[PDB]
Specification:
The structure holds three protein chains of three kinds.
Chain A (H helix, E strand, L loop, with lengths): L9
Chain B lengths: L3 E6 L9 E10 L5 E6 L2 E2 L4 E2 L3 E2 L5 E9 L7 E6 L7 E4 L5
Antiparallel strand pairs in B: 1-2, 2-7, 3-4, 3-8, 5-7, 6-7, 8-9
Chain C lengths: L1 E10 L8 E8 L2 E7 L8 E2 L9 H28 L9 E10 L5 E10 L2 E6 L6 E3 L2 H13 L1 H10 L1 H17 L6 E10 L2 E11 L5 E6 L2 E2 L3 E2 L3 E2 L5 E10 L6 E6 L7 E3 L4
Antiparallel strand pairs in C: 1-2, 1-5, 2-3, 3-4, 5-6, 6-7, 7-8, 9-10, 10-15, 11-12, 11-16, 13-15, 14-15, 16-17
Helix pairs in contact in C: 3-4
Classes of the chains: A little secondary structure, B mainly beta, C alpha+beta.
Bound molecules: zinc ion (ZN) (2 copies).
């Protein structure tokens, strides 16, 4: 179950 | 990061018996790399490459391999080109390791 | 100590707008899914047969996440170019590790979220799953940005929630195969080294998982002896050996021991003429 990243770097 | 190389057979080698020769390349960065395997100094045309992976310390690794039949006298090597090195690094197969 | 990880990579390509993006999922250090943007039309695919018991909806939902991650890494690479004041004609690399360790009581033991830029630590979520460790001046920009937006809460939710629940799902669905071991097959070889000295090499072949301990002993005391990094055989199993230089004629005083969770009993080997 892959992660979804929030705000970009 | 300078690539580390192991060259070794999948199975304990027996002369005259079909085997797999591995070239395990690790500890490198960036992931672009050129790997060639050579028999008696000559490029082996059918070489398989594993998919790209990296380990916990961020460095990449990859497994190249080829079908081979060891003999008493044939020499095999793995030749690696990577932007971390000036000269290509070549590691020869040693059946004792 | 079961685990799940996703290892992600984006590599920018000079003259092309889109980096190559690759995601690999692991359960207990063994690959079970993979996504690659350079594919014909990219999807998450099963890398272990037990994952095929997941339906079309699962694969479609996971694939849409990858498509998201792909964009996320593209924007992040461009941002990083700004922070480091780098040139656009070069290739650069952004990597991410995330996931969770689960105990035998199903308690989350540790959550992980780490990024690297150019192969160096960039920013990481601390063990508290609340605060960030930034490794350099550029990364402080990201840290401030992520503290401002409450990013850590989002990741905490995933790590404490979906990550551990889905890992348990996978453990349940793949149990038999996920728990399978291969025992090491061991032997000792004998090699000349120099005048008056020889090499004993203790081999362990065909084992899984990769974790293993090889030891050499003189009488019954452990030693310190060349130990190669554990290496893939290419067939799903691993190899390792340990060698020692010993004086001619003393070979029988040396004993190799092999410890592996797949063995019913630790091995004890000697050179056999
Ligand atoms: Zn075979
Ligand atoms: Zn016992």
């Amino acid at each position: 179950y892959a992660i979804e990243n929030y705000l970009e770097l | 990061k300078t690539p580390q190389i192991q060259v070794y057979s999948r199975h304990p080698p027996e002369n005259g018996k079909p085997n797999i020769l591995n070239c395990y390349v690790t500890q490198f960065h960036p992931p672009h790399i050129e790997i060639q395997m050579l028999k008696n100094g000559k490029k082996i045309p059918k070489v398989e490459m594993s998919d790209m992976s990296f380990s916990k310390d961020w460095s990449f690794y990859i497994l190249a391999h080829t079908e081979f039949t060891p003999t008493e006298t044939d020499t095999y090597a793995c030749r690696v080109k990577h932007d971390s090195m000036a000269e290509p690094k070549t590691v020869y197969w040693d059946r004792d390791m | 100590p079961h685990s799940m990880r996703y290892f992600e990579t984006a590599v920018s390509r000079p003259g092309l707008e889109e980096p190559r993006y690759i995601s690999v999922g692991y359960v207990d250090n063994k690959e079970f899914v993979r996504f690659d943007s350079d594919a014909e039309n990219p999807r998450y695919e099963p890398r272990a047969p037990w994952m095929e018991q997941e339906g079309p909806e699962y694969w479609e939902r996971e694939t849409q996440k990858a498509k998201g991650q792909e964009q996320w890494f593209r924007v992040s690479l461009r941002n990083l170019l700004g922070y480091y004041n780098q040139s656009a004609g070069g290739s650069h690399t952004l990597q991410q590790m995330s996931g969770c360790d689960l105990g035998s009581d199903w308690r989350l033991l540790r959550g992980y979220l780490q990024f690297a830029y150019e192969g160096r630590d960039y920013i990481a979520l601390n063990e508290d799953l609340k605060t960030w460790t930034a490794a350099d001046m550029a990364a402080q920009i990201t840290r401030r940005k992520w503290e401002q937006s409450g990013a850590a809460e989002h990741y905490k939710a995933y790590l404490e929630g979906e990550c551990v629940e889905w890992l348990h799902r996978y453990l349940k669905n793949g149990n038999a195969t996920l728990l399978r071991t291969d025992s090491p097959k061991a032997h000792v070889t004998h090699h000349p080294r120099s005048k008056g000295e020889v090499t004993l090499r203790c081999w362990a072949l065909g084992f899984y998982p990769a974790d293993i301990t090889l030891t050499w002993q003189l009488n019954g005391e452990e030693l310190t002896m060349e130990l190669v990094e554990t290496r893939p055989a290419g067939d799903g199993t691993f190899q390792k050996w340990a060698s020692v230089v010993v004086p001619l004629g003393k070979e029988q005083n040396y004993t190799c021991r092999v410890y592996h969770e797949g063995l019913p009993e630790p091995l004890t080997l000697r050179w056999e003429p």
